[PDB]
Write a protein that binds this ligand. Structure first.
Ligand SMILES: Nc1ncnc2c1ncn2C1O[C@H](COP(=O)(O)CP(=O)(O)O)[C@@H](O)[C@H]1O
Ligand SMILES: Nc1ncnc2c1ncn2C1O[C@H](COP(=O)(O)CP(=O)(O)O)[C@@H](O)[C@H]1O
Ligand SMILES: [Mn+2]
Ligand SMILES: [Mn+2]
Lengths: 187, 187
């Protein structure tokens, strides 16, 4: 395939809308910053989750601590470590890559890197703590629907059961977004 | 919270962009049709997956058979049964709800219902067949990143391991989108 022409329709606060012609076909893309989420597992197999209101659905959803990659030039896991601290007041000595997910491949370039933080330390000075098995059962019961949350909860669940393994921080993040950030539409 | 004012910025082919003022805060929302995906598991624990090019990432991704809810008034599982047939040429006698996922809760109202189709029959007249365990290991290895795919693969993996259970077709789909379809911006 090949992009014959790109046309920017709208630039917003956190994303930009663009319309391209391909291969001929029309493809409207939503350029996003990209984001990072954290699955902080403690010594007893529990992870913290936040209950946040999502205007898109008009209700609160259970999710993993997460943030947008809106900090130009800042390393993803640095962003992730900051959000973990600010969201649930936790510092972690060990960071690994749990799972990368492309949220809506159909119309957006957003990709989210989910980290697995361990060696937890309570620092600083709404949310709840869930045993991984429960968080997982909550997913399968529809109580956790946020795609990022589902991916992280079930991934660490595969790890906690010995089925799979975490990964190094230098693991390549293939689809990390760059378009919107490259615009640098701020001043 | 409360929407003080909604402003439609752009209506596209498969989604519409809208900007609302809330509670005051600005929230730009991408109205989507919603979609359905299928995890068709055969008598031996294998599921079919398609390899499709995603312009948003400029490469091909491994995904579950899926379709947009662009068929006005058509029941979701009917849409799902049609896509399963057209995508991998399979008919299924048993349909259950596996998992619902809200793709990018941060800026879109898109929600996807993932079904678990069993009692498979090859009908009709690129894709591949994967043992659930492998598909799962592929997710944890980053070879499967599509959020819908990750959610479906790992969910059916929790079911195949006896950890969780599928669900009835009448299971409420809380976040099923309605905004864009309610516009009926076609003729
Ligand atoms: N980002 C986009 N912008 C404009 N049209 C899109 C689009 N993404 C998909 N479409 C389209 O919507 C219709 C069906 O698309 P797909 O069957 O590729 C969706 P799916 O497998 O990605 O869920 C096609 O006719 C095509 O116009
Ligand atoms: N859909 C949207 N439209 C306009 N601004 C948005 C937005 N979604 C989030 N923002 C915002 O981006 C900044 C941080 O947002 P959040 O920390 O709520 C993101 P996250 O937990 O949803 O990943 C806020 O200053 C706010 O403007
Ligand atoms: Mn956040
Ligand atoms: Mn499709």
């Amino acid at each position: 395939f090949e992009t014959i022409s790109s046309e920017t329709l709208h630039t917003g606060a956190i994303f930009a809308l663009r319309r391209d012609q391909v291969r001929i076909v029309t493809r409207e893309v939503v350029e996003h910053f990209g984001a990072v989420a954290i699955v902080a597992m403690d010594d007893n197999g529990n992870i913290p989750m936040v209950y946040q209101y999502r205007h898109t659905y008009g209700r609160r959803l259970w999710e993993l601590p997460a943030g947008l990659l809106d900090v130009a030039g800042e390393p993803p896991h640095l962003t992730a470590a900051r959000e973990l601290r600010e969201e649930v007041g936790l510092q972690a000595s060990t960071w690994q890559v749990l799972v990368d997910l492309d949220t809506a491949p159909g119309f957006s370039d957003e990709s989210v890197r989910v980290y697995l933080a361990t060696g937890l330390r309570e620092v600083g000075r709404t949310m709840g703590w869930y045993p991984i098995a429960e968080a997982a059962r909550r997913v399968l019961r529809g109580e956790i629907v946020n795609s990022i949350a589902i991916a992280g909860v079930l991934a660490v669940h595969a790890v906690t059961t010995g089925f799979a393994q975490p990964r190094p921080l230098d693991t390549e993040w293939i689809d990390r977004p760059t378009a919107f950030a490259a615009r640098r539409a701020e001043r």
